[PDB]
Short mmCIF file of C-alpha atoms in Angstrom, two decimals:
data_model
loop_
_atom_site.label_atom_id
_atom_site.label_comp_id
_atom_site.label_asym_id
_atom_site.label_seq_id
_atom_site.Cartn_x
_atom_site.Cartn_y
_atom_site.Cartn_z
CA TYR A 223 26.13 77.18 46.30
CA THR A 224 29.69 78.58 46.01
CA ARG A 225 31.26 82.06 45.97
CA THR A 226 28.94 83.39 43.23
CA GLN A 227 29.96 82.81 39.60
CA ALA A 228 33.48 84.05 40.42
CA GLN A 229 34.30 80.73 42.14
CA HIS A 230 33.42 77.49 40.37
CA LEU A 231 34.41 73.81 40.39
CA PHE A 232 33.49 73.42 36.72
CA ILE A 233 37.06 72.50 35.71
CA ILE A 234 36.99 69.54 38.11
CA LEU A 235 33.45 68.68 37.01
CA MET A 236 34.37 68.72 33.31
CA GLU A 237 37.46 66.59 34.00
CA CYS A 238 35.23 64.07 35.80
CA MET A 239 32.76 64.08 32.90
CA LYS A 240 35.69 63.68 30.50
CA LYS A 241 36.50 60.51 32.47
CA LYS A 242 32.80 59.55 32.65
CA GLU A 243 33.45 55.96 31.50
CA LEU A 244 33.50 54.70 35.11
CA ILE A 245 30.69 56.87 36.54
CA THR A 246 27.43 54.99 37.11
CA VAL A 247 24.21 56.87 37.88
CA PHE A 248 21.31 55.18 39.67
CA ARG A 249 17.95 56.73 38.74
CA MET A 250 14.81 55.43 40.43
CA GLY A 251 12.13 54.32 37.99
CA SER A 252 14.44 54.45 34.98
CA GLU A 253 15.63 52.35 32.03
CA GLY A 254 18.29 50.12 33.59
CA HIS A 255 19.70 49.14 36.98
CA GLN A 256 16.63 49.68 39.14
CA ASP A 257 18.41 47.87 42.00
CA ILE A 258 21.31 49.31 43.99
CA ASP A 259 22.99 45.92 44.47
CA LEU A 260 22.83 45.32 40.72
CA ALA A 261 24.16 48.83 40.07
CA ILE A 262 27.13 48.31 42.40
CA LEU A 263 28.04 44.79 41.27
CA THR A 264 27.74 45.44 37.52
CA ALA A 265 30.01 48.48 37.87
CA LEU A 266 32.76 46.30 39.36
CA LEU A 267 32.90 44.08 36.26
CA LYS A 268 32.88 46.84 33.63
CA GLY A 269 35.17 49.00 35.77
CA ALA A 270 37.70 46.21 36.28
CA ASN A 271 38.47 46.21 32.52
CA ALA A 272 39.53 42.56 32.73
CA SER A 273 38.85 39.54 30.55
CA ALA A 274 35.88 37.19 30.69
CA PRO A 275 37.69 34.54 32.83
CA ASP A 276 38.48 37.21 35.43
CA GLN A 277 34.86 38.40 35.48
CA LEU A 278 33.72 34.79 35.88
CA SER A 279 36.21 34.30 38.71
CA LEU A 280 34.91 37.44 40.44
CA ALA A 281 31.29 36.30 40.09
CA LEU A 282 32.27 32.86 41.40
CA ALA A 283 34.01 34.41 44.41
CA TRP A 284 30.96 36.58 45.12
CA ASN A 285 28.61 33.57 44.74
CA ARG A 286 26.27 35.58 42.50
CA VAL A 287 24.97 33.39 39.68
CA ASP A 288 22.52 36.02 38.38
CA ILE A 289 25.32 38.52 37.71
CA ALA A 290 27.24 35.93 35.68
CA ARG A 291 24.05 34.85 33.90
CA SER A 292 22.97 38.36 32.87
CA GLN A 293 26.40 39.90 32.17
CA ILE A 294 29.19 37.34 31.66
CA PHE A 295 27.33 34.71 29.60
CA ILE A 296 26.12 36.83 26.69
CA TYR A 297 26.30 36.90 22.88
CA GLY A 298 29.85 36.29 21.67
CA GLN A 299 32.21 36.55 24.65
CA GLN A 300 35.21 34.72 23.09
CA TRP A 301 36.44 32.62 25.98
CA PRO A 302 40.11 31.59 25.73
CA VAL A 303 40.89 27.92 25.21
CA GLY A 304 41.05 26.06 28.51
CA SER A 305 39.31 28.76 30.58
CA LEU A 306 35.89 27.18 31.13
CA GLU A 307 37.60 23.97 32.28
CA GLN A 308 39.45 25.83 35.04
CA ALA A 309 36.27 27.73 35.90
CA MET A 310 34.43 24.41 36.27
CA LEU A 311 37.24 23.06 38.45
CA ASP A 312 37.13 26.14 40.69
CA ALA A 313 33.33 25.98 40.97
CA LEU A 314 33.58 22.26 41.77
CA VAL A 315 36.11 22.78 44.56
CA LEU A 316 34.23 25.69 46.16
CA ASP A 317 30.87 23.82 46.23
CA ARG A 318 29.05 26.14 43.81
CA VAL A 319 26.22 23.99 42.44
CA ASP A 320 24.56 26.86 40.56
CA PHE A 321 27.79 27.76 38.76
CA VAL A 322 28.45 24.11 37.87
CA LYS A 323 24.95 23.88 36.38
CA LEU A 324 25.44 27.17 34.52
CA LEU A 325 28.80 26.09 33.08
CA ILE A 326 27.41 22.70 32.02
CA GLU A 327 24.51 24.50 30.34
CA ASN A 328 26.93 26.94 28.65
CA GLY A 329 29.24 24.53 26.86
CA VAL A 330 31.50 22.42 29.07
CA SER A 331 31.24 18.63 28.85
CA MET A 332 31.93 16.48 31.90
CA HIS A 333 33.38 13.64 29.81
CA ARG A 334 36.41 15.60 28.60
CA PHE A 335 36.81 17.60 31.83
CA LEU A 336 37.21 14.72 34.29
CA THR A 337 40.66 13.11 34.20
CA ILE A 338 42.59 11.04 36.73
CA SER A 339 44.76 13.99 37.77
CA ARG A 340 41.75 16.30 38.12
CA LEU A 341 39.92 13.76 40.30
CA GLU A 342 43.09 13.38 42.39
CA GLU A 343 43.16 17.17 42.82
CA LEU A 344 39.46 17.17 43.75
CA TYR A 345 40.11 14.55 46.44
CA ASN A 346 42.88 16.70 47.99
CA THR A 347 41.24 20.11 48.39
CA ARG A 348 40.96 22.49 51.34
CA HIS A 349 38.25 24.91 50.12
CA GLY A 350 35.00 23.49 51.44
CA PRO A 351 33.04 22.36 54.49
CA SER A 352 34.24 19.77 56.99
CA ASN A 353 34.42 16.10 56.02
CA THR A 354 35.62 12.86 57.61
CA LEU A 355 37.60 11.53 54.63
CA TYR A 356 41.04 11.95 56.21
CA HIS A 357 40.01 9.99 59.31
CA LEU A 358 38.68 7.16 57.13
CA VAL A 359 41.90 7.09 55.09
CA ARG A 360 43.92 6.98 58.33
CA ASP A 361 41.71 4.15 59.64
CA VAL A 362 42.07 2.06 56.47
CA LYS A 363 45.85 2.61 56.52
CA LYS A 364 45.95 1.60 60.23
CA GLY A 365 47.74 4.81 61.17
CA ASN A 366 51.39 5.56 60.37
CA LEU A 367 50.27 8.25 57.92
CA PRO A 368 52.95 10.87 57.17
CA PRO A 369 51.94 14.54 57.46
CA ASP A 370 50.84 16.37 54.30
CA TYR A 371 49.95 13.15 52.50
CA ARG A 372 48.38 13.27 49.04
CA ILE A 373 45.41 10.90 48.87
CA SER A 374 45.70 8.66 45.82
CA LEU A 375 42.77 6.98 44.08
CA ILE A 376 43.99 3.57 45.30
CA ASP A 377 43.36 4.62 48.91
CA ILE A 378 39.94 5.92 47.86
CA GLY A 379 39.17 2.54 46.32
CA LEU A 380 40.31 0.84 49.53
CA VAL A 381 38.11 3.05 51.71
CA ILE A 382 35.15 2.48 49.35
CA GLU A 383 35.66 -1.28 49.67
CA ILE B 79 35.08 24.34 -11.14
CA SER B 80 31.88 23.49 -13.03
CA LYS B 81 30.73 21.01 -10.36
CA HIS B 82 33.05 18.13 -11.33
CA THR B 83 32.66 16.07 -8.16
CA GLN B 84 32.97 12.39 -7.30
CA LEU B 85 29.60 10.65 -6.92
CA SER B 86 30.69 8.41 -4.06
CA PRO B 87 28.07 6.69 -1.86
CA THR B 88 27.07 8.11 1.50
CA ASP B 89 29.25 7.25 4.49
CA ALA B 90 27.68 9.05 7.48
CA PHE B 91 24.31 8.13 8.97
CA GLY B 92 23.01 7.16 12.39
CA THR B 93 22.45 9.00 15.67
CA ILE B 94 24.42 11.82 17.32
CA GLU B 95 24.63 12.55 21.04
CA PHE B 96 24.87 16.27 21.85
CA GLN B 97 27.38 16.41 24.67
CA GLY B 98 27.17 19.86 26.21
CA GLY B 99 24.11 21.58 27.67
CA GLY B 100 22.00 19.93 30.35
CA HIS B 101 19.85 17.79 28.07
CA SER B 102 19.98 14.19 26.83
CA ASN B 103 18.96 14.83 23.23
CA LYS B 104 19.28 12.28 20.42
CA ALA B 105 19.07 13.18 16.74
CA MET B 106 18.99 10.95 13.68
CA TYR B 107 21.09 12.21 10.78
CA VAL B 108 22.01 11.23 7.22
CA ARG B 109 24.12 12.82 4.50
CA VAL B 110 22.75 12.78 0.95
CA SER B 111 23.45 14.56 -2.31
CA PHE B 112 21.52 17.72 -3.16
CA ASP B 113 20.06 15.99 -6.25
CA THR B 114 18.27 13.28 -4.23
CA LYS B 115 14.66 12.66 -5.24
CA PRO B 116 12.09 13.76 -2.61
CA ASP B 117 10.29 10.40 -2.85
CA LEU B 118 13.23 8.47 -1.39
CA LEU B 119 13.67 11.12 1.32
CA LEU B 120 10.00 10.77 2.27
CA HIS B 121 10.37 6.97 2.25
CA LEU B 122 13.35 7.18 4.61
CA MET B 123 11.57 9.71 6.83
CA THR B 124 8.41 7.59 7.06
CA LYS B 125 9.78 4.05 7.44
CA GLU B 126 13.46 4.27 8.42
CA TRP B 127 12.67 6.89 11.10
CA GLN B 128 9.14 5.68 12.02
CA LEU B 129 7.58 9.13 11.62
CA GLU B 130 3.86 9.27 10.89
CA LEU B 131 2.58 11.53 8.13
CA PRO B 132 2.12 15.09 9.45
CA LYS B 133 -1.19 16.91 9.65
CA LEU B 134 0.59 20.25 9.16
CA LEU B 135 3.90 21.61 7.84
CA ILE B 136 5.50 24.77 9.24
CA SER B 137 8.46 26.23 7.34
CA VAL B 138 10.66 28.74 9.16
CA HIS B 139 12.77 31.22 7.19
CA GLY B 140 15.15 33.80 8.60
CA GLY B 141 18.42 35.63 8.26
CA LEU B 142 21.69 33.73 8.28
CA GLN B 143 23.42 36.37 10.41
CA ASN B 144 22.99 35.97 14.17
CA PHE B 145 20.52 38.70 15.17
CA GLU B 146 18.86 39.34 18.53
CA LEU B 147 15.17 39.69 19.33
CA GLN B 148 13.85 42.10 21.93
CA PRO B 149 12.31 40.64 25.10
CA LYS B 150 8.55 40.05 25.46
CA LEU B 151 8.41 39.25 21.71
CA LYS B 152 10.52 36.11 21.30
CA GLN B 153 8.76 34.60 24.33
CA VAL B 154 5.25 34.83 22.87
CA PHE B 155 6.56 33.80 19.44
CA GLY B 156 8.21 30.71 20.89
CA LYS B 157 5.19 29.79 23.02
CA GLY B 158 2.81 30.17 20.08
CA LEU B 159 5.02 28.17 17.72
CA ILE B 160 5.46 25.40 20.30
CA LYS B 161 1.73 25.28 21.06
CA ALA B 162 0.85 25.15 17.35
CA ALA B 163 3.40 22.39 16.68
CA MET B 164 2.42 20.38 19.78
CA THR B 165 -1.39 20.57 19.82
CA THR B 166 -1.28 19.55 16.13
CA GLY B 167 0.75 16.68 14.74
CA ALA B 168 3.14 18.69 12.60
CA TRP B 169 6.69 18.96 11.30
CA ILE B 170 8.93 22.03 11.51
CA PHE B 171 11.41 22.54 8.68
CA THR B 172 14.39 24.65 9.76
CA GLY B 173 17.88 25.44 8.56
CA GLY B 174 19.48 23.21 11.19
CA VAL B 175 22.67 25.18 11.83
CA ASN B 176 22.75 27.27 15.01
CA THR B 177 22.59 30.62 13.20
CA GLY B 178 19.89 33.26 13.04
CA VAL B 179 16.27 32.37 13.73
CA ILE B 180 17.29 28.73 14.24
CA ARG B 181 18.78 29.71 17.60
CA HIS B 182 15.43 31.29 18.52
CA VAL B 183 13.61 28.08 17.56
CA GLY B 184 16.17 26.09 19.54
CA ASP B 185 15.67 28.08 22.73
CA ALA B 186 11.89 27.97 22.20
CA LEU B 187 12.12 24.17 22.09
CA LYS B 188 14.48 24.22 25.08
CA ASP B 189 12.06 26.25 27.22
CA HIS B 190 9.22 23.85 26.31
CA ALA B 191 10.90 20.52 27.11
CA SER B 192 11.54 21.72 30.68
CA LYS B 193 7.81 22.09 31.47
CA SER B 194 5.78 19.72 29.26
CA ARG B 195 5.71 16.15 27.97
CA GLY B 196 5.69 15.15 24.31
CA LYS B 197 8.13 15.68 21.47
CA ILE B 198 8.19 18.00 18.45
CA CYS B 199 9.33 16.67 15.07
CA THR B 200 11.81 19.43 14.27
CA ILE B 201 13.78 18.68 11.10
CA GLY B 202 16.93 20.54 10.05
CA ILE B 203 18.03 20.60 6.42
CA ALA B 204 21.56 21.98 6.61
CA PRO B 205 24.48 22.02 4.16
CA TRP B 206 27.34 19.68 4.99
CA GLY B 207 30.06 22.28 4.43
CA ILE B 208 29.17 24.54 7.38
CA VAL B 209 29.34 22.05 10.28
CA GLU B 210 32.22 22.77 12.64
CA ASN B 211 33.18 19.06 12.68
CA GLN B 212 32.84 17.35 9.31
CA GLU B 213 34.68 14.46 10.98
CA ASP B 214 33.56 12.82 14.25
CA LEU B 215 30.30 12.06 12.40
CA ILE B 216 31.33 9.41 9.82
CA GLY B 217 30.20 6.42 11.90
CA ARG B 218 27.61 4.59 9.80
CA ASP B 219 24.60 3.44 11.86
CA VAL B 220 26.40 4.01 15.17
CA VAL B 221 26.26 6.59 17.95
CA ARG B 222 28.64 9.53 17.48
CA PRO B 223 29.42 12.05 20.25
CA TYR B 224 29.03 15.71 19.31
CA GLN B 225 30.21 18.85 21.09
CA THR B 226 27.96 21.91 21.30
CA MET B 227 30.76 24.29 22.33
CA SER B 228 31.56 26.91 19.69
CA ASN B 229 34.77 28.73 18.78
CA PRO B 230 34.10 32.09 17.06
CA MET B 231 37.43 31.95 15.17
CA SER B 232 36.64 28.63 13.45
CA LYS B 233 34.74 30.42 10.61
CA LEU B 234 32.01 27.76 10.84
CA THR B 235 28.95 27.02 12.98
CA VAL B 236 27.86 24.12 15.15
CA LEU B 237 24.80 21.94 14.65
CA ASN B 238 21.83 23.14 16.70
CA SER B 239 20.68 20.75 19.42
CA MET B 240 17.03 20.18 20.41
CA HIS B 241 16.37 19.04 16.83
CA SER B 242 14.80 15.65 16.21
CA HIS B 243 16.28 14.84 12.79
CA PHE B 244 18.83 16.19 10.33
CA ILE B 245 19.14 16.04 6.54
CA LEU B 246 22.66 17.03 5.49
CA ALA B 247 22.91 17.96 1.80
CA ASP B 248 26.29 18.44 0.12
CA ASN B 249 27.28 19.60 -3.36
CA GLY B 250 31.00 18.99 -2.83
CA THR B 251 31.92 22.44 -1.53
CA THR B 252 32.89 23.44 2.02
CA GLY B 253 32.21 26.69 3.86
CA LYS B 254 29.42 28.08 1.67
CA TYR B 255 25.62 27.97 1.70
CA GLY B 256 23.15 27.30 -1.11
CA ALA B 257 23.32 23.48 -1.10
CA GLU B 258 19.94 22.86 0.57
CA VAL B 259 17.32 25.41 -0.56
CA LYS B 260 16.28 23.55 -3.73
CA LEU B 261 16.09 20.19 -1.95
CA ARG B 262 14.05 21.71 0.88
CA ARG B 263 11.62 23.30 -1.58
CA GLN B 264 11.29 20.05 -3.56
CA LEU B 265 10.60 18.08 -0.37
CA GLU B 266 7.98 20.64 0.70
CA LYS B 267 6.33 20.39 -2.73
CA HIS B 268 6.30 16.59 -2.62
CA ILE B 269 4.90 16.40 0.92
CA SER B 270 2.28 19.06 0.11
CA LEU B 271 0.84 16.81 -2.62
CA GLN B 272 0.86 13.84 -0.23
CA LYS B 273 -2.62 12.74 0.80
CA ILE B 274 -3.87 13.12 4.37
CA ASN B 275 -5.92 10.29 5.91
CA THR B 276 -9.21 12.02 5.03
CA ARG B 277 -10.77 10.80 1.78
CA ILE B 278 -12.04 14.23 0.68
CA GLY B 279 -8.96 14.74 -1.49
CA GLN B 280 -7.14 17.48 0.40
CA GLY B 281 -3.41 17.24 1.05
CA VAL B 282 -1.15 18.26 3.91
CA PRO B 283 -1.45 22.02 4.53
CA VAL B 284 1.79 24.01 4.37
CA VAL B 285 2.45 27.38 6.00
CA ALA B 286 5.51 29.64 6.04
CA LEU B 287 6.77 31.60 9.05
CA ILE B 288 9.01 34.63 8.42
CA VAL B 289 11.20 36.13 11.16
CA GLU B 290 13.94 38.67 10.33
CA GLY B 291 15.08 38.13 6.75
CA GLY B 292 17.24 39.72 4.10
CA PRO B 293 17.54 40.38 0.36
CA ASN B 294 16.46 36.79 -0.41
CA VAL B 295 13.53 36.48 2.03
CA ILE B 296 11.45 38.70 -0.27
CA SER B 297 12.34 36.40 -3.17
CA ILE B 298 11.39 33.23 -1.30
CA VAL B 299 8.13 34.85 -0.13
CA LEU B 300 7.35 35.77 -3.75
CA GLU B 301 8.12 32.26 -4.99
CA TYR B 302 5.88 30.90 -2.23
CA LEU B 303 3.04 33.20 -3.31
CA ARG B 304 3.56 32.27 -6.99
CA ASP B 305 3.23 28.50 -6.52
CA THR B 306 0.38 26.75 -8.30
CA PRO B 307 -1.14 25.98 -4.89
CA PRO B 308 -0.64 29.26 -2.98
CA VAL B 309 1.18 28.87 0.34
CA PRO B 310 0.14 31.41 3.01
CA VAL B 311 2.91 33.14 4.95
CA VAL B 312 3.06 34.74 8.40
CA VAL B 313 5.48 37.58 9.15
CA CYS B 314 6.44 39.51 12.28
CA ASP B 315 6.87 43.26 12.69
CA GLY B 316 9.32 43.47 15.60
CA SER B 317 12.20 41.70 13.85
CA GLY B 318 13.55 44.79 12.06
CA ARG B 319 14.66 43.15 8.80
CA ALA B 320 12.67 42.80 5.54
CA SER B 321 9.88 41.17 7.57
CA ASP B 322 9.43 44.56 9.24
CA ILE B 323 9.68 46.25 5.83
CA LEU B 324 6.96 43.95 4.48
CA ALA B 325 4.83 44.56 7.58
CA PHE B 326 5.15 48.31 6.99
CA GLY B 327 4.27 47.75 3.32
CA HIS B 328 1.12 45.94 4.44
CA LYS B 329 -0.14 49.38 5.41
CA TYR B 330 -1.00 51.62 2.43
CA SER B 331 -1.62 48.95 -0.19
CA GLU B 332 -2.47 49.63 -3.84
CA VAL B 333 5.81 56.22 -1.67
CA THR B 334 9.14 55.35 -3.32
CA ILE B 335 11.63 57.81 -1.77
CA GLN B 336 11.16 56.06 1.59
CA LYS B 337 13.02 52.97 0.31
CA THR B 338 16.45 54.50 1.08
CA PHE B 339 17.52 52.48 4.13
CA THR B 340 21.25 52.10 3.27
CA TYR B 341 20.53 48.36 3.07
CA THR B 342 21.16 47.76 -0.66
CA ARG B 343 23.27 49.40 -3.38
CA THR B 344 21.88 52.91 -2.75
CA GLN B 345 18.68 53.92 -4.57
CA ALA B 346 20.13 52.58 -7.83
CA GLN B 347 19.45 49.00 -6.68
CA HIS B 348 16.01 48.19 -5.28
CA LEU B 349 13.75 45.20 -4.66
CA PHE B 350 10.57 47.26 -5.01
CA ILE B 351 9.33 45.35 -8.08
CA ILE B 352 9.18 42.02 -6.26
CA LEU B 353 7.98 43.82 -3.12
CA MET B 354 5.03 45.35 -4.99
CA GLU B 355 4.31 41.99 -6.62
CA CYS B 356 4.13 40.44 -3.14
CA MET B 357 1.87 43.29 -2.01
CA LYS B 358 -0.27 42.72 -5.10
CA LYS B 359 -0.70 39.13 -3.90
CA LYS B 360 -1.30 40.33 -0.32
CA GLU B 361 -4.48 38.24 0.08
CA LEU B 362 -2.44 35.47 1.75
CA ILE B 363 0.10 37.58 3.69
CA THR B 364 -0.53 37.64 7.45
CA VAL B 365 1.13 40.11 9.83
CA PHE B 366 1.40 39.40 13.56
CA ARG B 367 1.49 42.51 15.77
CA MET B 368 1.38 42.70 19.56
CA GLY B 369 -1.45 44.87 20.85
CA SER B 370 -1.84 46.91 17.67
CA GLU B 371 -4.14 44.42 15.92
CA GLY B 372 -6.04 41.20 16.55
CA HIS B 373 -4.65 37.66 16.59
CA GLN B 374 -2.36 38.29 19.56
CA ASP B 375 -1.41 34.58 19.66
CA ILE B 376 1.08 33.07 17.22
CA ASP B 377 -0.64 29.66 17.19
CA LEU B 378 -3.95 31.36 16.37
CA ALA B 379 -2.23 33.43 13.66
CA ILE B 380 -0.73 30.34 12.03
CA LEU B 381 -3.82 28.13 12.23
CA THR B 382 -6.33 30.74 11.05
CA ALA B 383 -4.12 31.48 8.03
CA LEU B 384 -4.33 27.82 6.96
CA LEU B 385 -8.14 27.93 6.73
CA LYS B 386 -8.47 31.23 4.85
CA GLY B 387 -5.42 30.39 2.73
CA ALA B 388 -6.76 26.98 1.75
CA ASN B 389 -9.67 28.64 -0.12
CA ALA B 390 -11.78 25.51 0.42
CA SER B 391 -15.38 24.99 1.48
CA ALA B 392 -16.77 24.81 5.01
CA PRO B 393 -16.76 20.95 5.13
CA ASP B 394 -13.05 20.96 4.25
CA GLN B 395 -12.29 23.54 6.95
CA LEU B 396 -14.25 21.44 9.45
CA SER B 397 -12.33 18.33 8.37
CA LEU B 398 -9.03 20.17 8.84
CA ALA B 399 -10.05 21.39 12.31
CA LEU B 400 -11.17 17.85 13.18
CA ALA B 401 -7.84 16.41 12.03
CA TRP B 402 -5.94 19.00 14.07
CA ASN B 403 -8.13 18.31 17.14
CA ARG B 404 -8.63 22.05 17.70
CA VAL B 405 -12.20 22.76 18.77
CA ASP B 406 -11.60 26.46 19.49
CA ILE B 407 -10.52 27.14 15.90
CA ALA B 408 -13.71 25.53 14.57
CA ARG B 409 -15.82 27.32 17.19
CA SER B 410 -14.42 30.79 16.46
CA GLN B 411 -13.93 30.56 12.67
CA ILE B 412 -15.97 27.77 11.07
CA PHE B 413 -19.25 27.98 13.03
CA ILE B 414 -20.34 31.57 12.38
CA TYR B 415 -23.34 33.38 10.88
CA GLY B 416 -24.30 32.27 7.38
CA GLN B 417 -21.95 29.44 6.41
CA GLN B 418 -24.24 27.50 4.01
CA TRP B 419 -23.31 23.91 4.75
CA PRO B 420 -24.10 21.51 1.88
#
């Protein structure tokens, strides 16, 4: 394949196999990773060398609940204090029902999570589909609404009434 | 110290709500001393909790350390245990804390409640000194919230959800086991002698299920086999712990240099004397193997062991099968060639 045995790329090959921690091999009909999409996505979590909250954030951004179920939520992951709460908040803003269900199943309690400030933040988000809440708030206030107005829970009570 | 503790009255009983996973699970709980008489415990379990007398008792023993089971084995084990405990009115005695085989029983119960009706009377007898929150549970006869989230650095473990009732036994210590084995054995002995509704004279059958294990599982198996009424046991081969060692020892009954597993204090310390005593009383040991042998179903393995292990006559086996409302067990075991009915 090359210029006989006189020319070889074995030095480069042995350097690559010395750094074989990142190399992933997909073998058809083999032990693990029979799917290409699973082989690619699982390599991005191990190869990132980040913490569990960062892996959960990546899986939440990719909207892949099976990757987080089979890799991130495993035996003894040692989540930092206050990480699952922020993960639940991010999944709640981005309209990720599967991730909310998975996080509720995997430890978080909605009674301690939901506070007045968190609900206020949830009512003033931008990540999500279109909604007519701002028009209703403007209509209840009879106009004269300053730009970049934070919607308080009192206005939400008024619009509910 | 030499157990110089204050004999104060109990101050924590009622119902706990497991805030956490996506289930609305209630669980009665009391805290009692480890010297409590089994008669009062049975009285409280029968009248204060409105639990009818069981037709069967299943005792689960396993390793304290959190092990993992391979796939395609824990699924059939859980399905068989759930089917045996649901088709028959029975109680399941477990450790209670979310460690070891108790987690397997918990997920087996979790996977059953999502597809079928009915409830299983799972009872956890756990020491009081290992709960992650000794507080937040002291409300007498009132609902107490409980959190299922676990912190690995807390050096304790959380109470396992999907359990119907809890019996918390304390000897005054905190952070150590050994405060519930004697009480659990005494309660099993007292409920075994309790009389079933049939007027033949037979009591509640008791079986033992062994998954994983350790240096003390062989001892508890031996003390089960040495009881005045013998208690049949059922072990599994795919666990890898002393249950697997006992399953291997089931082959070639009655090889001593094969005991070196780097699991005890070299070859100088061995449990082979109690192991060979158990294998000498191997007439009641039952091994469940997938594909290699018969009895591929856990519920069939448990129920058929209770008829052979009872060592009673055919009318008593028929009465037991009638009480359990299992017609297939009576069809396949009791009604065979040459049974000599009185």
